[PDB]
């Protein structure tokens, strides 16, 4: 039959093959060439300081036991053939829970050229660890890494490399950005060696630079806190006799300021230190108690227009303006 030619080629390739041994176990070093096609940089979850990335992981290596001579130069086979030959044991160092998609068939690729060069592509939704220093929250930038290398294979056995130039070995698709909060500034790769309890391993690093956009928090936290301060600023224009009016001004600014303080923290994790949003909330909260203590002293000194009210109608909004022009110019630049 016509298809018998490829069947006997594959059965001659797999005859006498040991898939437990890497190519050139006692003779040379197995060089595995790697590149990543990031199909969609998924959402970054701050609560767990993690991020999801869907990639077309691609590896390539030279195997001398898969040489053939036939009518076709490249054998584009299925996944079944991938489990019967040696494949490198690449694992992600900082991955948490990643799935190799297998719907409707296992998403794998295997192309055996006539000189023995292989190509092994897979789809991996890698959930990795992105450690965060949120001292400048929300006006911060992160470099979420993606470190991968070969388990059970020392530097003297399996080394890794990028198949193209390292500037062009991690390609992010143009439509592929599922980031709603951040935006992806650029990619960054590096290759190094790690010395672990067992031996020295080659690790390949990919840093994804991110930058948080201040659009959700300049409408949920910053602007409501500014409006809460300004609503405490209008209580100085009221009458000295209207004690319940300025009283409900003070207590409602205190309650709205503290419920903004509570509901603002239900966003980032429970870090021990205090972010820039915490400093803004603290200063605005102190301005609200200053507005309340001003009315308390006025009610202590009541019996004419108060000089305390006339001084606080001028000093308090200009001090708020100086605080804003200090804080925003310190943290945005």
């Amino acid at each position: 039959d016509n298809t018998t030619v490829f069947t006997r080629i594959l059965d001659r390739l797999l005859d006498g093959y040991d898939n437990r041994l890497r190519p050139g176990l006692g003779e040379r070093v197995t060089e595995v060439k790697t590149d990543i096609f990031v199909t969609s940089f998924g959402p970054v979850s701050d609560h767990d300081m993690e991020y999801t990335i869907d990639v077309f992981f691609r590896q390539s290596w030279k195997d001398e036991r898969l040489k053939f001579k036939g009518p076709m130069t490249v054998l584009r086979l299925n996944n079944l053939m991938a489990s019967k030959i040696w494949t490198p044991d690449t694992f992600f160092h900082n991955g948490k829970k990643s799935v190799a998609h297998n719907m409707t068939m296992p998403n794998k690729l295997l192309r055996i050229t006539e000189d023995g060069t292989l190509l092994y592509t897979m789809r991996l939704t890698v959930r990795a660890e992105c450690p965060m220093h949120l001292e400048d929250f929300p006006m911060d930038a992160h470099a979420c890494p993606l470190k991968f290398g070969s388990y059970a294979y020392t530097r003297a056995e399996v080394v890794y490399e990028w198949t193209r130039e390292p500037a062009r070995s991690v390609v992010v698709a143009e439509d592929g950005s599922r980031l709603n909060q951040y935006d992806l500034l650029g990619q960054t790769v590096d290759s190094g060696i790690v010395q672990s309890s067992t031996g020295e391993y080659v690790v390949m690093t990919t840093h994804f630079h991110l930058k948080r956009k201040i659009g959700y928090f300049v409408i949920q936290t910053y602007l409501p806190c500014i409006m809460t301060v300004i609503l405490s600023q209008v209580s100085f224009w009221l009458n000295r006799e209207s004690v319940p009016a300025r009283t409900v001004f003070g207590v409602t600014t205190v309650l709205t300021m503290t419920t903004l303080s509570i509901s603002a923290r239900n966003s980032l994790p429970k870090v021990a230190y205090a972010t820039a949003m915490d400093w803004f909330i603290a200063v605005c909260y102190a301005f609200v108690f200053s507005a309340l203590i001003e009315f308390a002293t006025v009610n202590y000194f009541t019996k004419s227009v108060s000089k305390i009210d006339r001084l606080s109608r001028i000093a308090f909004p200009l001090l708020f303006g100086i605080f804003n022009l200090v804080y925003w110019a310190t943290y945005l630049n």
Partner: antibody, heavy 116, light 105 residues
Framework: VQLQQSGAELVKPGASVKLSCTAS????????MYWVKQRPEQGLEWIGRIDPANGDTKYDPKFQGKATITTDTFSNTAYLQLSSLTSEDTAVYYCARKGLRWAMDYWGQGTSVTVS | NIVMTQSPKSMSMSVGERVTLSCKASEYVGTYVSWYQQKPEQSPKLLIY???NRYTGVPDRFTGSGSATDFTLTIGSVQAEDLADYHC????????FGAGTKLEL
């Protein structure tokens, strides 16, 4: 393991020169081949890149058009094509094999071109 | 492109002391530099790959170092046969080269 180049060349300006180097001990389909320009008493200048398994060639923006790199499979050889030779093209040329961690491992002996 | 700005042009000292080099990058190249020696009437030879990886046949006196942007090549007790010219390259992008540091007596 040995990269043997051609001999020295001396032609008139505005002409064309064929330049070549042959790699032995391995195959060029595995590693990239790099061409470099070394002006006398000057630094190294990268000419271009060729992938012999794919045929894809990448060049420096300042060397596009005047220089192109070709190759063949049977003879295991890389070729240069230089056109519109001038006084500033008088240099010595090496072909460099891409090595471990992209480091320009092996180098040829060098062919000195001269115009008159 | 990536611009290599290695400094200085040449150094002139004696035999048997420490001399250091420097290779400053305009943009990020991450541990992908390379150092070569250039004798007169001689092709370049590889010395250091990666950031600090000694090639086979390199003596132990040749010690490199590297970072994200700043690179250097430290020589310990340089001898008379090492009077050559040193070049710093990069290969994180399409490869470029520096000017060249010479050695003199």
């Amino acid at each position: 393991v040995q990269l043997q180049q051609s001999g020295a060349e001396l032609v008139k300006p505005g002409a064309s020169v064929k330049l070549s180097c042959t790699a032995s001990g391995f195959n060029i389909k595995d590693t990239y081949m790099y061409w470099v320009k070394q002006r006398p008493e000057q630094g190294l200048e990268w000419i271009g890149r060729i992938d012999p398994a794919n045929g894809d060639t990448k060049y420096d923006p300042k060397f596009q058009g005047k220089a192109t790199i070709t190759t063949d499979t049977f003879s295991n050889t890389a070729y240069l094509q230089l056109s519109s030779l001038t006084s500033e093209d008088t240099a010595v040329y090496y072909c460099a094999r891409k090595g471990l961690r992209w480091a320009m491992d092996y180098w040829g002996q060098g062919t000195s071109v001269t115009v008159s | 492109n990536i611009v290599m700005t290695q400094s200085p042009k040449s150094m002139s000292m004696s035999v048997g002391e420490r001399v250091t080099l420097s290779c400053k990058a305009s943009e990020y190249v991450g541990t992908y530099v390379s150092w070569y020696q250039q004798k007169p009437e001689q092709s370049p030879k590889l010395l250091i790959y990666g950031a600090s990886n000694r090639y086979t046949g390199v003596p132990d006196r040749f010690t490199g170092s590297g970072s994200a942007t700043d690179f250097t090549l430290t020589i310990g007790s340089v001898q008379a046969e090492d009077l050559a010219d040193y070049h710093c390259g990069q290969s994180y992008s399409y490869p470029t080269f520096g000017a060249g540091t010479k050695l003199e007596l």
